[PDB]
């Protein structure tokens, strides 16, 4: 029997979702592209990229820092070019992010007021930028990646621009803080350059200011859908700049809007936590050009900041998020009738907590602050505060526990810990190379030597640089489109044997003394967890589809692998959450522990098993003895303290009052 130390004293709180953006334009006729991804903006400055294939797995995370946020996200997908992401931090800068490294490729100043809204034209060669001073700035991007140029300033006005939308590339539609919708001409070779063709005023609340939070253009019906602080949804005739229909649907501000590919449905959401579906699907409605308030649904416990829509032959996704810090996913065609998923608030694809078997130390790092606890019942031995604004990416603790390595993309710092008076004394060991070194992943060979994978994927050994050779990866159209798939995702060091997994699935065995690379595996699904077992002389690899693969180190894949890879128990297959962490069992080496965000599993690798909707159907390619428990959830981190002790770490705002009638 085994000992469980259930821990909730470690608290990690996700930042509120602020923006959402898909990387491709919906095409119902065509199949879902392999490169489709979802970008998620967070109030802490973090940007998260997710893949809608194989349920939903998070391919890469861009780390934010102190006193920074994301308020608008925008994709540009030019044929033959890498996928391009842009973000606005609430200040007078448009940030271009290097997806390969996750660092800011370019920072461009709008030469205007603070940015409130960002939008791209259909040709994807121009960005429209909304400013608080009422200026809308047009920026060129067609020059190339990393190229941001000032094109034109539209007609100036005195109201803050809260949102922006495009009609092809001719006109810019903007909602303003004065309760007026404004249209400008971006037609080139036109005398009406930058002029305000029409002005539309919404119904204005008598006792409070009226704000147009969201506006969207509807190509099929050449209409504008606008959301306003009064809770009104208004449909406007584009050519005549006149109100067609008005609906008092929401009880609070409508913060965001979205529509389907055919413009048969408009989905509104915002403060009142409800999603209202507006339908024009019926033929008679289409002839009459009249919308219908089809239905509404309450799915979020707090404000819905962002909603986005994607559709294809194999995809039908309505994704929403907000202050609740969780994703809610729906089917546009069956929003009223379809089932929904509430995404877990934290899925530890990247672990923010580590457990040290020796000294019984638990270490958690969050927002440049590192806390270490000791447990015999738990005491906070020491708390470390780091000056630099950039959040900590990874922290690694030595097998003696004396040496703690803190890694950030900007810098890597090493701190020695000495136990004095049931407390840890912190002394920063000075290593110039580490300070100037970017650290995507760091691991300990022993109490002294470490392996660091740079943001450029340069693997080297530092004794406390001995670079390690790495096999070249053939370029692919998917790799060009999404750069980071070819980047190293997981780095594990186990008794001198180092295994690196890339997002494209490339698994290679690296010998650290020899510093030579030998190819092991190249999986066609994203790799979610890796483990090396010296006793069985095998490496365990888990893909996004939750299939388990155990590779002998040189006939590669252990005989258990065949008999059990496709013969996994029903629990493993039924999981819609992918495995993220693997750790061995001290008592028996063959047994291995596997856990996800909400589940923990143990599998004996010496025993063969008895043979006996809201995700992409996956018709297209990704590129181009048994114990199962779900009692413990959500799980930040799980590992063993001793041979008979298991450590489980778990997680422990004012919202709208929508009364639940009870009789």
């Amino acid at each position: 029997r085994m000992i469980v130390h259930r821990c909730r004293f470690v608290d990690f709180t996700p930042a509120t979702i602020t923006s959402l953006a898909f990387s491709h334009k919906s095409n119902i006729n065509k199949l879902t592209p392999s490169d489709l991804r979802l970008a998620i903006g967070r109030s802490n400055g973090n940007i998260e990229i997710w893949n809608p294939r194989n349920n939903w797995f998070q391919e890469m995370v861009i780390e934010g820092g102190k006193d920074r946020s994301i308020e608008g996200l925008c994709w540009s997908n030019v044929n033959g070019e890498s996928l391009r992401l842009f973000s606005i931090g609430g200040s007078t800068v448009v940030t271009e992010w290097d997806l390969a490294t996750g660092l800011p490729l370019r920072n461009y100043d709008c030469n205007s007021g603070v940015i409130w809204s960002i939008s791209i034209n259909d040709s994807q060669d121009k960005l429209s930028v909304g400013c608080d001073n009422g200026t809308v700035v047009l920026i060129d991007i067609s020059g190339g990646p990393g190229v941001l140029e000032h094109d034109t300033i539209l007609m100036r006005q005195e109201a803050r621009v809260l949102t922006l939308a495009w009609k092809k590339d001719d006109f810019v539609i903007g909602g303003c803080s004065d309760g007026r919708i404004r249209i400008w001409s971006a037609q080139k070779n036109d005398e009406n350059m930058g002029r305000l063709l029409h002005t539309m005023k919404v119904d204005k609340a008598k006792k409070e200011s009226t704000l147009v939070w969201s506006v969207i253009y509807l190509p099929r019906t050449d209409q504008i859908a606008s959301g306003d602080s009064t809770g009104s949804i208004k449909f406007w005739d584009f050519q005549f700049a006149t109100l067609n229909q008005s609906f008092k649907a929401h009880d609070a501000d409508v913060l965001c809007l979205t529509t389907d590919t055919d413009n048969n449905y408009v989905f509104s959401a915002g403060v009142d936590r409800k999603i209202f579906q507006f339908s024009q699907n019926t033929n008679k409605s289409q002839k009459n050009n009249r919308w219908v308030n089809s239905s509404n649904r309450l799915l979020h416990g707090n404000d819905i900041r962002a909603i986005c829509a994607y559709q294809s032959k194999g995809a039908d996704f309505l994704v929403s998020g907000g202050v609740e810090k969780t994703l809610v996913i729906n089917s546009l065609t069956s929003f009223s009738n379809g089932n929904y998923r509430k995404m877990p608030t934290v899925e530890p694809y990247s672990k923010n907590v580590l457990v040290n078997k020796e000294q019984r130390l638990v270490v958690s790092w969050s927002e440049s602050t590192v806390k270490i606890w000791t447990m015999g019942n738990y005491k906070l031995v020491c708390k470390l505060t780091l000056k630099d604004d950039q959040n900590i990416s990874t922290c690694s603790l030595s097998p003696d526990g004396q040496v703690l390595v803190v890694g950030r993309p900007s810098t890597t710092k090493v701190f020695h810990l000495q136990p004095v008076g049931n407390k840890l004394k912190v002394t920063k060991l000075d290593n110039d190379l580490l300070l100037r070194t970017s650290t995507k992943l760091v691991k300990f060979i022993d109490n002294s030597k470490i392996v660091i994978c740079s943001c450029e994927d340069d693997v080297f050994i530092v004794d406390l640089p001995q670079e390690v050779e790495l096999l070249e990866v053939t370029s692919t159209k998917s790799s060009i489109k999404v750069p980071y798939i070819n980047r190293i995702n997981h780095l594990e060091v186990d008794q001198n044997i180092a295994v690196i997994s890339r997002g494209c699935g490339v698994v290679d065995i690296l010998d650290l003394k020899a510093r030579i690379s030998k190819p092991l595996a190249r999986l066609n699904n994203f790799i979610t967890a890796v483990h090396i077992n010296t006793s069985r002389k095998s490496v365990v690899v888990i893909t996004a589809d939750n299939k388990i693969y155990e590779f002998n180190m040189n006939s590669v894949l252990t005989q258990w692998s065949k008999n059990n890879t496709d013969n996994l128990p029903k629990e493993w297959k039924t999981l819609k959450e992918n495995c993220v962490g693997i750790f061995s069992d001290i008592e028996n080496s063959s047994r291995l522990w596997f856990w996800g965000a909400t589940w923990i599993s143990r599998i004996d690798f010496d025993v063969d098993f008895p043979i006996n909707g809201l995700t992409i159907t996956d018709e297209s390619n990704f590129m181009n003895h048994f114990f199962f428990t779900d009692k413990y959830k959500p799980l930040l981190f799980v590992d063993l303290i001793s041979s008979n002790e298991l450590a489980i770490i778990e997680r422990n705002q004012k919202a709208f009052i929508q009364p639940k009638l009870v009789f």
Partner: peptide
Amino acid sequence: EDDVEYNEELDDAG
């Protein structure tokens, strides 16, 4: 927490 808190800026200063 102040007993076990460590501040880098104060440590850097002295």
